[PDB]
Amino acid sequence: SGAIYVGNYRVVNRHLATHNDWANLVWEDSSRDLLVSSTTAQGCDTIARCDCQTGVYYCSSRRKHYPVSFSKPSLIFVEASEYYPARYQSHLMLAVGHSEPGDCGGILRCQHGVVGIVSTGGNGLVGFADVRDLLWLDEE
Numbered sequence: 001s002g003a004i005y006v007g008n009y010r011v012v013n014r015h016l017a018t019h020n021d022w023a024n025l026v027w028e029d030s031s032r033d034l035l036v037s038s039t040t041a042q043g044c045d046t047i048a049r050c051d052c053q054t055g056v057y058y059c060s061s062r063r064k065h066y067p068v069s070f071s072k073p074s075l076i077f078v079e080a081s082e083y084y085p086a087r088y089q090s091h092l093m094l095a096v097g098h099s100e101p102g103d104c105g106g107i108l109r110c111q112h113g114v115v116g117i118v119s120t121g122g123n124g125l126v127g128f129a130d131v132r133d134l135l136w137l138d139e140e
């Protein structure tokens with residue numbers, strides 16, 4: 001579990017969004033596993049606006065932050081699960097690391113700010129849904 005809080009926005013994995021998120025919806029994209037809802041109070045996370053390929057992510061299943069190298073956001077095949085059929089997920093970045101069910105929502109950060117959140121796992125890999133292209137998160 002986990003979310004990004006920027007301005008009056010809450011960014012969460014679409015497959016983990018609560019009833020309250022759907023009742024206060026801003027934007028969602030199933031192909032990216034992202035959902036953004038509106039918040040009453042201002043958030044303080046800064047979104048990275050960069051092309052960094054090294055950062056640090058939080059892994060709840062180990063209670064540890066790990067330094068990782070990760071790929072550029074790409075269309076990657078993700079195996080069928082209880083939340084989606086087998087499909088290509090867009091804007092996804094992979095790293096070698098631990099990720100189990102329960103780790104989605106962990107933040108990946110570089111020197112510029114938040115890069116994205118854990119969205120996939122297994123086979124000794126961890127996948128992060130990028131948010132650096134969502135420039136509107138910084139305004140209105």
Ligand SMILES: CSC[C@@H]1C[C@@H]1C(=O)N1CCC[C@H](C(N)=O)C1
Nearest residue numbers: 033081100101104119120121122
């Ligand atoms: C971090 S949960 C890891 C277990 C292996 C499972 C995994 O990768 N997915 C299950 C949850 C939905 C994900 C998606 N974004 O399509 C895919």
Ligand SMILES: [Zn+2]
Nearest residue numbers: 050052110112
């Ligand atoms: Zn960066």
